[PDB]
Amino acid sequence: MAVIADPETAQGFRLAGLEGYGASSAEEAQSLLETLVERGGYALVAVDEALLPDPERAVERLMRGRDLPVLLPIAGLKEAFQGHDVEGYMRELVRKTIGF
């Protein structure tokens, strides 16, 4: 893999469960993100909402099709984070199908 977030949370990808050595480096961690996925040979590419890819479109516009190893938004930081309910609901209905 290749999963990266904040430092503290980056530690555990360094262990097992997930593979990773990065953390933040940009806004969406472009320095690593783009360069890495170009090869795409990694078991998984997951970019957490600890970086926050506002343009998930950058990767899709460039890849031009691939569901194999491409970011999955999770969370990556703790503030009793379980807010990807109220966020995913609105992220789906707005651009695909009828609005909320």
Next chain:
Amino acid sequence: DDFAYLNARVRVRRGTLLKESFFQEALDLSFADFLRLLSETVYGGELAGQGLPDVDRAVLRTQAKLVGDLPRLVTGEAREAVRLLLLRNDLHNLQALLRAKATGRPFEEVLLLPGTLREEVWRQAYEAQDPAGMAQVLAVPGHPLARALRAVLRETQDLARVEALLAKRFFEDVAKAAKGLDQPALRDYLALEVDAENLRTAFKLQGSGLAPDAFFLKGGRFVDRVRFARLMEGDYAVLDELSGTPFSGLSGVRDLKALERGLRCVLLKEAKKGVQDPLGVGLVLAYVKEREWEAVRLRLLARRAYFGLPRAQVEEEVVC
């Protein structure tokens, strides 16, 4: 020989151990203020940067000058004794060095420190590629991990297995030497530390792919090779037959946090009574344990303070 001067220096250094009321005031603090608080104390004379890794390094520099020079400042029977406590941290250092050598990755991303085995010895070991070169470098100080290593490595060179067996032979040898210095506080500390180690080791190393009986050690109470295998498979029914320990009340508990808290707090109190035998290794034994548990605690508070984790997530641990 000689502990008189060593013991005297170590008592003066107690004057600067961080007090309980420190960690009370500290919980109410965020990271910026903890650092301002920390810089007043003696770890503070080695504090650097506003990053977390720069704090971790600042702990290491404190530990180097106040604990890692201690085997060097004395000789003979005194050096062997100070060495025996430091050997256990050298064992973390060797395992990490050996792994960097075997898997071909840099020297870096290990935790070293100076003591019995100095910074350059570890550097020399890394630079001796052949297992035989490696074995002789380690034989230079003559220290008990060498003599454990010489025996162990002849049988097998499989990395994970070298580590495991290095730990069992190293502990069989240690248990005798430490019981054998004939200090009652250290022996009482040793029986619980061992009972505690057997339990703790089973929790961490489950799923490694190794033998259960390559993690057992001399000083063990009701525990035996069969029970260690029972635990490694994940059964806590071993604990309901375990008794006579003061750890008997952590029995029946499945929660990881609560078990480890209880083992650690007992060993702390046990070592602190080491000053009722300040003669000899007592006073330095007590000192090493209090300074380790303060560094762990510095690290728990810092992380809690930076990332916005609950007050209670560390407030319970800091008061035993």
Next chain:
Amino acid sequence: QAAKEAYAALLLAQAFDGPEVVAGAALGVPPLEGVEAEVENVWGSKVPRLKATFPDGALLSPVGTPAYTLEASRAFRRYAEALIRVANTETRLKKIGEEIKKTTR
């Protein structure tokens, strides 16, 4: 919330035991193409889907802080497992992209 729990409360005690857990592991982490890729026919042709199913491991970590370590290693279940959820719901999202475009057109 129990994934991050242990995670975030460890960094300074370790950070060189990344090495330790991967080494000691017996195929506990596949770094290249460990995923379970699935073929799946839908409206907008063969789109591949996939689920994050690889061995992740639980309580196989030593060193660090005695309690936080163990906990952190147990947390690994809550990476692998959870990510599958999103592995099939977000991928569905893209399939329904096709549908939507061709449709609305």
